[PDB]
Structure formats: structure tokens, C-alpha cells
Design an enzyme around this catalytic site. Structure first.
Site, PDB file in Angstrom:
ATOM      1  CG  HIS A  16      -1.939  -1.149   1.156  1.00 11.97           C
ATOM      2  ND1 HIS A  16      -2.823  -1.424   0.120  1.00 11.97           N
ATOM      3  CD2 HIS A  16      -2.112  -2.153   2.067  1.00 11.97           C
ATOM      4  CE1 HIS A  16      -3.511  -2.535   0.409  1.00 11.97           C
ATOM      5  NE2 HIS A  16      -3.090  -3.009   1.589  1.00 11.97           N
ATOM      6  CD  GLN A  41     -11.292  -3.970  -5.564  1.00  9.20           C
ATOM      7  OE1 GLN A  41     -11.461  -2.735  -5.692  1.00  9.20           O
ATOM      8  NE2 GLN A  41     -12.270  -4.856  -5.516  1.00  9.20           N
ATOM      9  CG  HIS A 130      -6.877  -4.030   7.711  1.00 17.21           C
ATOM     10  ND1 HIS A 130      -7.406  -4.690   6.638  1.00 17.21           N
ATOM     11  CD2 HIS A 130      -7.935  -3.438   8.318  1.00 17.21           C
ATOM     12  CE1 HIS A 130      -8.709  -4.502   6.540  1.00 17.21           C
ATOM     13  NE2 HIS A 130      -9.046  -3.716   7.598  1.00 17.21           N
TER      14      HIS A 130
HETATM   15  N1  LIG Z   1     -14.873  -1.257  -3.606  1.00 19.25           N
HETATM   16  C1  LIG Z   1     -13.629  -1.141  -3.184  1.00 19.25           C
HETATM   17  N2  LIG Z   1     -12.903   0.143  -3.280  1.00 19.25           N
HETATM   18  C2  LIG Z   1     -11.678   0.239  -2.910  1.00 19.25           C
HETATM   19  N3  LIG Z   1     -10.978  -0.816  -2.324  1.00 19.25           N
HETATM   20  C3  LIG Z   1     -11.529  -2.011  -2.226  1.00 19.25           C
HETATM   21  C4  LIG Z   1     -12.887  -2.171  -2.656  1.00 19.25           C
HETATM   22  N4  LIG Z   1     -13.201  -3.520  -2.460  1.00 19.25           N
HETATM   23  C5  LIG Z   1     -12.155  -4.088  -1.929  1.00 19.25           C
HETATM   24  N5  LIG Z   1     -11.098  -3.266  -1.716  1.00 19.25           N
HETATM   25  C6  LIG Z   1      -9.670  -3.551  -1.122  1.00 19.25           C
HETATM   26  O1  LIG Z   1      -9.089  -4.376  -2.228  1.00 19.25           O
HETATM   27  C7  LIG Z   1      -8.215  -5.348  -1.559  1.00 19.25           C
HETATM   28  C8  LIG Z   1      -8.473  -6.556  -2.138  1.00 19.25           C
HETATM   29  O2  LIG Z   1      -9.671  -7.044  -1.589  1.00 19.25           O
HETATM   30  P1  LIG Z   1     -10.151  -8.675  -2.137  1.00 19.25           P
HETATM   31  O3  LIG Z   1     -10.145  -8.429  -3.574  1.00 19.25           O
HETATM   32  O4  LIG Z   1     -11.603  -8.531  -1.640  1.00 19.25           O
HETATM   33  O5  LIG Z   1      -9.187  -9.683  -1.672  1.00 19.25           O
HETATM   34  P2  LIG Z   1      -8.137 -10.204  -0.779  1.00 19.25           P
HETATM   35  O6  LIG Z   1      -6.915  -9.823  -1.407  1.00 19.25           O
HETATM   36  O7  LIG Z   1      -8.269 -11.691  -0.671  1.00 19.25           O
HETATM   37  O8  LIG Z   1      -8.147  -9.744   0.706  1.00 19.25           O
HETATM   38  P3  LIG Z   1      -7.322  -9.092   1.793  1.00 19.25           P
HETATM   39  O9  LIG Z   1      -8.158  -8.518   2.858  1.00 19.25           O
HETATM   40  O10 LIG Z   1      -6.438 -10.007   2.501  1.00 19.25           O
HETATM   41  O11 LIG Z   1      -6.594  -7.892   1.213  1.00 19.25           O
HETATM   42  P4  LIG Z   1      -5.313  -7.029   1.522  1.00 19.25           P
HETATM   43  O12 LIG Z   1      -4.141  -7.905   1.471  1.00 19.25           O
HETATM   44  O13 LIG Z   1      -5.245  -5.812   0.688  1.00 19.25           O
HETATM   45  O14 LIG Z   1      -5.681  -6.578   2.982  1.00 19.25           O
HETATM   46  P5  LIG Z   1      -5.059  -5.408   3.895  1.00 19.25           P
HETATM   47  O15 LIG Z   1      -3.756  -4.965   3.420  1.00 19.25           O
HETATM   48  O16 LIG Z   1      -6.100  -4.324   4.003  1.00 19.25           O
HETATM   49  O17 LIG Z   1      -5.061  -6.076   5.299  1.00 19.25           O
HETATM   50  C9  LIG Z   1      -4.005  -7.082   5.646  1.00 19.25           C
HETATM   51  C10 LIG Z   1      -4.622  -8.228   6.468  1.00 19.25           C
HETATM   52  O18 LIG Z   1      -5.061  -7.523   7.739  1.00 19.25           O
HETATM   53  C11 LIG Z   1      -5.872  -8.389   8.375  1.00 19.25           C
HETATM   54  N6  LIG Z   1      -6.985  -7.582   9.099  1.00 19.25           N
HETATM   55  C12 LIG Z   1      -8.320  -7.107   8.674  1.00 19.25           C
HETATM   56  N7  LIG Z   1      -8.806  -6.308   9.641  1.00 19.25           N
HETATM   57  C13 LIG Z   1      -7.782  -6.090  10.655  1.00 19.25           C
HETATM   58  C14 LIG Z   1      -7.786  -5.340  11.730  1.00 19.25           C
HETATM   59  N8  LIG Z   1      -8.750  -4.556  12.250  1.00 19.25           N
HETATM   60  N9  LIG Z   1      -6.626  -5.382  12.467  1.00 19.25           N
HETATM   61  C15 LIG Z   1      -5.533  -6.128  12.138  1.00 19.25           C
HETATM   62  N10 LIG Z   1      -5.517  -6.908  11.018  1.00 19.25           N
HETATM   63  C16 LIG Z   1      -6.747  -6.896  10.319  1.00 19.25           C
HETATM   64  C17 LIG Z   1      -6.401  -9.469   7.375  1.00 19.25           C
HETATM   65  O19 LIG Z   1      -5.833 -10.742   7.600  1.00 19.25           O
HETATM   66  C18 LIG Z   1      -6.051  -8.746   6.052  1.00 19.25           C
HETATM   67  O20 LIG Z   1      -5.785  -9.806   5.075  1.00 19.25           O
HETATM   68  C19 LIG Z   1      -8.387  -5.282   0.081  1.00 19.25           C
HETATM   69  O21 LIG Z   1      -7.541  -4.194   0.654  1.00 19.25           O
HETATM   70  C20 LIG Z   1      -9.731  -4.270   0.039  1.00 19.25           C
HETATM   71  O22 LIG Z   1      -9.818  -3.666   1.248  1.00 19.25           O
END
Ligand SMILES: Nc1ncnc2c1ncn2[C@@H]1O[C@H](COP(=O)(O)OP(=O)(O)OP(=O)(O)OP(=O)(O)OP(=O)(O)OC[C@H]2O[C@@H](n3cnc4c(N)ncnc43)[C@H](O)[C@@H]2O)[C@@H](O)[C@H]1O
Length: 135
Positions: A16, A41, A130
């Protein structure tokens, strides 16, 4: 999902913050080669890691993506960002995945946690882990 050589904070930075090209197709190759799939995405925030760490110091709020978590924080100001969307999925050759890119200026909400005791640098006791929402 996270490859094993990363802490959550390092993985947040890789997915990110460190957009290694201003073109999504090129920048996404890094993420996808680490995850072994083409992520559908992804947002890159055009801000610094230190700026995100300082957002972790803003008031706690409920995470919009999960109403049971209270470790989220609003950015306060908007930042420029680039959102990447998969246009071409290449199952059996991830390097041939292609993306669209959308520039925007938006607020963001990040979840933050205590650093990984063994692997994260002591410089930052509290780190982003996240990206919960862009608004
Ligand atoms: N309409 C839209 N507009 C814009 N953006 C959009 C969108 N729809 C979806 N997105 C974003 O597109 C991405 C792809 O989503 P998606 O396409 O839905 O798939 P994903 O890659 O399987 O899911 P991940 O949640 O694991 O994504 P990530 O690695 O990006 O997670 P993050 O770095 O935030 O987090 C890392 C890890 O943190 C962990 N986690 C979640 N909540 C918490 C928390 N409160 N505290 C600590 N860890 C947490 C999880 O294990 C997560 O995998 C996700 O960021 C999503 O948020």
C-alpha cells in the site's frame, strides 16, 4: 495473504505504500509474485510510511469493514492515491496480468497494532497492518 518473510507492517508497506512504478500493471507484479496469484484490486496511498504511523496516533474508531474491531484510525486529511483493478487475469502466467489505474484524492482508515516484537524495527512501536477503507 502474507508471505512468511514479512511482518504485517512490512507487508502493508509493500502492498500500500511502495508503488514501484506509477503504472499499475508493473507495480502489481511485485504483490502478485509474492502472493502467487493476481490480486483482483489494490490501493497504493501516495504518502509516506511515517505519515501512516502518525495516523495510528489519531483517535480509535470502529473499522467499517469489521464492526467487532476498534483498532482503526482515520487519516484526518485526504491523500492522493492510485487504485489498481485487474482487467486481464492470467491464471497460468501471473506476469501477464494487466490492470487499470484510477487516480483519486481520498481519506483512508487504517488498522494499527503493536509491532512484531522479533522482526519489526524498534523505531515504531505502533504500526499500520491493514487498509480498512478509502473514502
Ligand atoms: N470497492 C472497493 N474500493 C476500494 N478498495 C476495495 C474495494 N473492495 C475491496 N477493496 C480492497 O481491495 C483489496 C483486495 O480485496 P479482495 O479483492 O476482496 O481480496 P483479498 O486480497 O483476498 O483480501 P485481503 O483482505 O487479505 O486484502 P489485503 O491484502 O489488501 O488486505 P489489507 O492490506 O487491508 O489487510 C491485511 C490483512 O489484515 C488483516 N486484518 C483485517 N482487519 C484487521 C484489523 N482490524 N486489524 C488487524 N488486522 C486486520 C487481514 O488478515 C487482512 O488480510 C483489500 O484491501 C480491500 O480492502
Amino acid at each position: 495473504m502474507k508471505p512468511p518473510q514479512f511482518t504485517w507492517a512490512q507487508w502493508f508497506e509493500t502492498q500500500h505504500i511502495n508503488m514501484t512504478s506509477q503504472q499499475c500493471t508493473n507495480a502489481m507484479q511485485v504483490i502478485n509474485n509474492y502472493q502467487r496469484r493476481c490480486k483482483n484490486q489494490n490501493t497504493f496511498l501516495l504518502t509516506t510510511f511515517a505519515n501512516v504511523v502518525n495516523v495510528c496516533g489519531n483517535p480509535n474508531m470502529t473499522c467499517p469493514s469489521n464492526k467487532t474491531r476498534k483498532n482503526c484510525h482515520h487519516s484526518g486529511s485526504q491523500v492522493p492515491l492510485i487504485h489498481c483493478n485487474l482487467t486481464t487475469p492470467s491464471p497460468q502466467n501471473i506476469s501477464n496480468c494487466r490492470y487499470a489505474q484510477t487516480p483519486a484524492n481520498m481519506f483512508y482508515i487504517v488498522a494499527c497494532d503493536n509491532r512484531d516484537q522479533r522482526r519489526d524495527p524498534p523505531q515504531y512501536p505502533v504500526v499500520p497492518v491493514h487498509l480498512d477503507r478509502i473514502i
